[PDB]
Amino acid sequence: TRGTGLMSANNIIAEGIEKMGVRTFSQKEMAFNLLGLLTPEVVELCQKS
Amino acid sequence: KDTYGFSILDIVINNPVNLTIHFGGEKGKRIRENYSAMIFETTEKIFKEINEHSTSYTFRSEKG
Amino acid sequence: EQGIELEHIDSKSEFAHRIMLTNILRMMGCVKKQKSARGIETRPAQVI
Ligand SMILES: NC(=O)C1=CN([C@@H]2O[C@H](COP(=O)(O)OP(=O)(O)OC[C@H]3O[C@@H](n4cnc5c(N)ncnc54)[C@H](OP(=O)(O)O)[C@@H]3O)[C@@H](O)[C@H]2O)C=CC1
């Protein structure tokens, strides 16, 4: 994740990393991914195991 | 408690104004089923808001 | 924790490990105890 916190300082090599077919995420993207785990279906899936 | 997710003794002792039943987990799902199976053939379902996507239901009143 | 190798693990690393592992376990336990003391068995908290 690019931006602040702990992963900042590594933003200058994000493009070089992504040149290998990898994905780096912004904080909005990572927040969207994490909020995807609070959806009703994922909640039920967590309740199952 | 096992069938509808509330204790009658709690209502008799504390007289709550509102009571919410939570359907999380297997037990909760079973209680939701027991809630959904109720009908008023005369075949309307009682608790018409409860369905397979309901996570909770709330009994409501004014004084108790 | 920046530039703290194995030989540098000290007070600050211990305090960070407390924050990031031990007190998250303690907070989970506290939430469990609070829901059990109230008979809540059908409204689990999701821990991300
Ligand atoms: N790429 C990434 O960023 C990755 C992150 N993670 C993990 O996911 C989480 C995401 O956080 P992230 O924003 O990245 O990291 P940050 O370090 O930015 O977030 C930690 C925040 O916690 C608050 N904090 C610090 N110490 C204490 C304390 N003693 N008590 C209460 N609050 C405190 C601080 O904010 P404030 O002082 O404003 O309260 C701080 O900004 C982290 O736990 C991280 O380890 C895991 C893998 C990759």
Side-chain angles (χ1 to χ4, degrees), chain A, chain B residues 1-40 43-51 53-61 64, chain C:
Chain A
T1 313
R2 309 182 309 272
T4 331
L6 34 69
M7 209 55 183
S8 214
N10 268 303
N11 283 11
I12 54 166
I13 56 160
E15 191 181 358
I17 271 291
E18 284 196 348
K19 282 188 182 69
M20 302 262 320
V22 173
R23 192 57 152 64
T24 64
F25 309 86
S26 68
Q27 283 166 326
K28 275 187 179 294
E29 282 168 346
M30 194 40 75
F32 174 86
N33 302 344
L34 286 169
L35 290 168
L37 303 164
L38 295 177
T39 63
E41 38 264 14
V42 179
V43 168
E44 226 47 50
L45 187 70
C46 287
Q47 290 177 8
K48 253 103 74 183
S49 81
Chain B
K1 287 199 244 65
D2 302 342
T3 314
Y4 292 99
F6 65 80
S7 54
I8 190 69
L9 281 162
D10 174 69
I11 292 174
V12 161
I13 291 161
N14 303 119
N15 202 15
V17 178
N18 297 316
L19 172 62
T20 301
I21 290 73
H22 293 283
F23 303 133
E26 167 58 25
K27 185 190 179 65
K29 266 77 192 184
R30 297 199 309 265
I31 291 150
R32 193 175 54 185
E33 291 168 17
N34 300 342
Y35 270 96
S36 275
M38 285 167 96
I39 49 194
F40 163 64
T43 88
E44 146 202 282
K45 265 189 181 188
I46 318 173
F47 309 115
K48 296 164 194 56
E49 48 261 85
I50 303 183
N51 48 71
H53 294 135
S54 284
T55 55
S56 83
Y57 174 75
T58 300
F59 287 105
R60 286 200 156 86
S61 79
Chain C
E1 296 155 281
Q2 305 120 306
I4 304 169
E5 269 187 44
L6 175 73
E7 87 197 41
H8 305 125
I9 284 162
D10 229 331
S11 195
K12 183 181 174 180
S13 293
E14 266 217 71
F15 180 71
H17 188 64
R18 175 175 240 230
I19 285 160
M20 300 166 69
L21 195 255
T22 314
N23 278 19
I24 297 180
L25 298 178
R26 283 197 177 101
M27 157 158 31
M28 289 177 68
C30 282
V31 171
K32 156 68 191 295
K33 287 196 291 290
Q34 295 284 1
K35 294 171 182 278
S36 275
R38 302 171 168 76
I40 301 150
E41 330 291 345
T42 59
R43 185 184 179 178
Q46 189 187 16
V47 187
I48 309 294

